[model samples]
Target: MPLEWRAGASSDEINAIIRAVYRQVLGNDYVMSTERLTSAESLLRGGEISVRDFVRAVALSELYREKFFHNNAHNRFIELNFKHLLGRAPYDQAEVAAHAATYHSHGYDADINSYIDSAEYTESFGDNVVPYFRGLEHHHHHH
Candidate 1:
């Protein structure tokens, strides 16, 4: 399934949710500084939590909900993983397109394009998405 990149809420709302999510996941003053943010990233990469758990944390963080933007890889990973976890494919490319459109509409072209052109999207995950979906299909059929 293709990704749906659309924002279901305003950027401010989204950021607030992300911040709260992060706070809940870390259970510490994890948003006090850039260093803390990096620490959170390290914890995430170090297998302290699954990608979904990380995003859930971010989605719940005050920083994320208030900032309304995210690191490109982080954002893309969340979107892709959300689709996977939900067991649903995007209804159309427009769902994904709408996210870019929203960003551009709000003068966030650079951030939006950064995610779109990211190595994860352009190379790593993009290359594997088809197989991933096939795997999902197989999982669904068997279960």
Candidate 2:
């Protein structure tokens, strides 16, 4: 299994986790200094927030909104949210449409919270383990 960050995790390990979260959630985009979420980063480093919460903060941050939401099409944004947060594409078109409707009706906060606050998220990542690309697990042999 991949390493999970705990309360007393080393600074290096935490740094790696931060990089992974940015890589995974931002679709591997290079984050500029201005785009970084320093407040949330501080909370995570100080053990004031869970990895799950960190993911939420990043997903809901203005940078994510600008990069993934404002310019992207509605359905595309929904699909990207699935990949970024749930680590997979939508299972089907209806699934994508469902979330699109969700965002339309419930607005951004609920739309973003739906994935992070899900039971699937809880079961898969818990508090300490970072969310990962489980959809590609079959192709990864070295554990």
TM-score of each: 0.25, 0.86
Q: After superposition, how far is residue 3 of candidate 2 from its true place, in Å?
A: 3.1
Superposed model 1: Cα runs more than 4 Å off: 1-33, 68-143
Give the clash total for candidate 2. Answer: 0
The residue-level lDDT of candidate 1 at 142 comes to: 11
Candidate 2 lowest-lDDT run of ten:
134-143
Off by over 4 Å in 2: 135-143
Per-residue C-alpha lDDT of model 2 across residues 1-143, encoded as one tens digit per residue: 65478766789778877777777788865376784788899999999999999988888787878877778887888888888888878969989888888888988878888999999988778888778766532111122
User: In candidate 2, which residue pairs clash?
Assistant: none
